[PDB]
DNA sequence: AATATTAAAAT
DNA sequence: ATTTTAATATTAAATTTTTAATAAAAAAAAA
DNA sequence: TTTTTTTTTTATAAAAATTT
């Protein structure tokens, strides 16, 4: 396909937050726009990417692509790549390399960079639109800082939403973390507030370093959606570049 | 070698023990005893059913647990002072003969689990098959001179001589595992002194000071008591354990109130009990002259000791020579001083509930 | 007890400070003020921690408290709080849970932190209160960056005083080194200049890795008080701001 | 009887922290002229050409041509003692083999005085001469260093291609083809960063990468790489240490 | 020379 | 009744070098 | 210039082996 990206720097933060987690990914992209629909690598966790067709500048997408890519080795390719760099996706159909030609923002260095695809079984799982009752819209700053400090304490984080205030609860071998978070709604810049939803008082366990993992895509928005019910693994939405979205998933 | 002393304490006088760090004796000579260690290195190192041995058949276990625990004491910061077993007292012969009868009764097991044709009961009863010889110390004497850690030899048995290093300060310690030495009169005991790669075991450290402020005893009150809780010099009165020990020592305040009344057809005082003369080998034994002996840590000669651990006993070269490297580091380090010397431990406790 | 501390990165940097010298320590916690004597598990070093009450906010303390805490766990939660953040202090009767609220500067993200305690017992040191001899006073970014540089080539400063001043030593298998200071009366600075206080050229020998566990609290105090004199251990002082001090003890060799 | 005032500390640690990665002891040739030096690396591999002569220094008199040794990895410890805006003078004797190395403060605040001991090792001073090259590129050094660390993830090789417009860096490893087809800039507005090529012809063979990864810590040095190559020579990797020398790389392919 | 324990004492 | 006690069994290690994992910096990448 | 942000490097705690 070709699929050039002026902001590279989402797929590279894409590939960052991704690297760590799952290792072999099947990137089932068509001319509706990249998506990826894959668990874990120990099958615990989800993670569903969405990069629509729209937020390219250039898309060309003839065939319905589904290519599998090592993230480990991709993220190699993307670490070579620059922070303003515009990073182009390519493929051809007969022969199985992924071209990434890059552009320096110059227009005086074109590093191209070729991805040896391997053949694996293609992730069909699908997931219906649940009644998510509490959404939780806080920024990643606070979330990064609330997973990564609530991880020196325990393993598991008991989130209590509720009308007012959401309860991120933490308690392990080391004492007992209890982070409470205000609906802010006076100081705030529109990307600082956090929003709960009033459907009902949620309280269920979710355990760490899986969402530390779900926090590793931190600079990909300063919003986290945190959609979830008292039964549903909840979404933790990463809104990639008002192009898509980085959904994760997790069992309780 | 006193039966239920350590529970005694720990289940009586718990302020006196006070369990501590192997770092928390920086710059402390403290004064080992040597055949307790020898017997834990020929019993602990071991493969497949033999002790570890060189390509000439002599025994060399000990030589390495020395070598690797007088090092690990080097780092921790502790000055050791190997003060090595001498000639046991006379009174000390039923308690040698009742080993030889344990050894013998050992071998004969040995014989007999080697006709049934086991490994485990074979290096069990060959784990219990250990003795010191005069060679087994003069080559650990040896390697301590050349390490340069301070070497004695005892006249008498060397918990004794512990207990004279530390009763004249020349050494703050006496870091035997042997309950008889805080009866031989170390005011510092300290026990389970196993420095080693983050075992994190806690040094049992036994003080007499706050034994003898606790039990309400004294000096010779306390070998009365442990007299009568049983030594390696005499027998015990049967039917007398510890607690019982410790209300008779309280409220006869001697062992010749104990003597003179006490009933006869229940319990059985022996005939040939020699309580005397163990009460006055526990007060006055023939230790050592403790200000007459070289207490020096010399700078360790590093060629004598590869020729020596690589001529005699074909060690690996890199293991040692890495050894005396941080040896040396640690020399360097044992200069250092302590805030104790400087400031006067007030706050003994500083409890938190 | 109920100690609300506004300058929270104050109590962050002083168990960033007591992270790594000791693990453990006792809080003598009285109503004149918070106070941690405490020596190092080595048993060589000491930190002498004042942290009074008229430098908190609004300080409470019915009995007089002493609990026992894990200070690597204890930074491990504090490393939580910002910046900028409000910590508060809360604490029962028994020595049993240590609250730790951070309370966020604009007020959106209160963090409750219990904490288990420890009940152990630790060693104090009557310390006299005596004029040292040599009074140096130094800016700490130096100090810090004496000791964490003379440590690569030495294992023990020689810290020599004189007329000209403070001749930090070092001596090693790597090579020789010297650094040497000067007292500046004529520039009248407030934080750069190095004020040396003399009575006897006091030339003691320090280690220097107690050195580099001592320059972990240059953040508290810009101003360091490197008071010693002959044969008396080194004391360290990062006089925090407004509240007291972290006076670090250390035997000579 | 040797003195190397030199005014900018931060280049000289540059240089020692840039020879710490490949050689372990070399010998510097110091002379009445400059301060050179000449080593292979440790894998007996590459060549390190160093030269710092004396126009650049601020004060220079040399008399004795002391081809005297240090173990680099020292220096380079002794060197992170430095200061940044620090002045080194590197200073020597004749009986004494101990290669003084006093670090004069931005200000007159302190001095920093290194004795080091001489870890004497004679090399081979072979005379390298300096040809003519097929390829030569003047490429920016942070790009460079861009290019040989984002290359090192891919393979154990590196293609240069000599194209006419512009230098292509090439890797076929295991994750697949690496090749940046970089462009020819000679623009008037990029003072230094433009790459500038004198190519009077083609040239196209496999070059090494970890040692490459090792020639590209002298980065801070120089904004560019004088990079020069021909066919069945080896590589020169140049940094221009300011206006005081040349620190020549050299690379078997 | 140490610890555990359990039937057997031990009143 | 408990708890007291003399019997009866048992062990006593310390590396260096690897295993997955750690948390403090090295050392840039970017406010 | 100040502050994050990561790979690296680190002493680290568990666990294999055998240290002769």
């Not at chain 1, 606070?142 to 209590?160: K, N, T, W």
């Not at chain 2, 250092?336 to 003994?348: E, I, P």
Request: glycine share 6%; with cysteine.
């Amino acid at each position: 396909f070709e699929a050039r990206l002026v902001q590279g720097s989402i797929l590279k933060k894409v590939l960052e937050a991704l690297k760590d987690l799952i290792n072999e990914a099947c990137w089932d992209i068509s001319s509706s726009g990249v998506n990826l629909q894959s668990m874990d690598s120990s099958h615990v966790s989800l993670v569903q990417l969405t990069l629509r067709s729209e937020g390219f500048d250039t898309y060309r997408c003839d065939r319905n692509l589904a290519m599998g890519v090592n993230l480990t080795s991709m993220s190699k390719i993307l670490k070579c790549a620059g922070n303003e760099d515009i990073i182009t996706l390519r493929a051809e159909d007969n022969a199985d390399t992924l071209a990434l030609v890059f552009e320096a923002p110059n227009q005086e260095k074109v590093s191209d960079y070729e991805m040896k695809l391997m053949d694996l079984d293609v992730e069909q799982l699908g997931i219906p639109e649940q009644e998510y009752s509490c959404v939780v819209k806080m920024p990643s700053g606070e979330f990064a800082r609330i997973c990564r400090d609530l991880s020196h304490i325990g393993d598991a984080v008991v989130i209590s939403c509720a009308k007012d205030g959401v309860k991120f609860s933490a308690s392990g071998e080391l004492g007992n973390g209890n982070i409470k978070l205000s609906q802010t709604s006076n100081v705030d810049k529109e990307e600082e507030a956090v929003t709960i939803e009033m459907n009902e008082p949620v309280q269920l366990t979710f355990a760490l370093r899986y969402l530390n993992f779900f926090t590793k895509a931190t600079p990909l928005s300063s919003t986290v959606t945190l959609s979830m019910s008292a039964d549903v693994p909840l979404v933790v939405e990463y809104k990639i570049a008002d192009m898509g979205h980085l959904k994760y998933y997790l069992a309780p | 070698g006193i039966q239920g002393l350590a529970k005694l304490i720990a289940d009586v006088a718990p302020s006196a023990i006070r369990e501590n760090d192997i770092k928390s004796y920086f710059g402390r000579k403290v004064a080992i005893d040597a055949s307790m260690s020898i017997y834990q290195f020929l019993i602990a190192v071991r493969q497949g059913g033999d002790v570890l041995q060189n390509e000439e058949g002599e025994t060399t276990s000990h030589l390495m647990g020395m070598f690797y625990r007088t090092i690990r004491m080097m780092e921790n910061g502790i000055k050791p002072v190997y003060v090595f077993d001498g000639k046991p007292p006379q009174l000390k012969s039923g308690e040698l003969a009742k080993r030889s009868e344990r050894r013998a009764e050992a071998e004969k097991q040995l014989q007999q689990a080697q006709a049934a044709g086991a490994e485990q009961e074979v290096e069990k009863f060959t784990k219990r098959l250990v003795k010191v010889t005069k060679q087994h110390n003069d080559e650990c004497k040896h390697l301590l001179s050349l390490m340069g850690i301070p070497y004695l030899d005892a006249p008498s048995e060397a918990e004794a001589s512990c207990a004279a290093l530390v009763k004249a300060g020349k050494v703050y310690a006496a870091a035997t595992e042997d309950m008889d030495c805080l009866t031989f009169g170390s005011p510092v005991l300290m026990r389970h002194l196993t420095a080693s790669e983050a075992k994190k075991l806690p040094i049992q450290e036994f003080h007499l000071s706050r034994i003898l402020q606790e039990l309400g005893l004294n000096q010779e009150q306390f070998v009365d008591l442990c007299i009568l809780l049983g030594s390696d010099y005499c027998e015990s009165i049967r039917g007398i354990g510890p607690k019982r020990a410790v209300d008779l020592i309280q409220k006869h305040k001697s062992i010749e109130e104990i003597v003179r009344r006490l009933d006869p057809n229940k319990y059985p005082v022996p005939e040939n009990w020699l309580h005397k003369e163990a009460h006055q080998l526990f007060l006055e034994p023939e230790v050592l002259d403790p200000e007459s002996v070289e207490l020096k840590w010399s700078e360790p000669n590093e060629e004598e000791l590869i020729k020596f651990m690589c001529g005699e006993k074909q060690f690996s070269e890199e293991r040692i020579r890495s050894g005396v490297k941080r040896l040396s580091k640690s020399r360097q380090g044992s200069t250092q001083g302590r805030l104790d010397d400087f400031f006067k431990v007030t706050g003994s406790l500083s409890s938190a509930k």
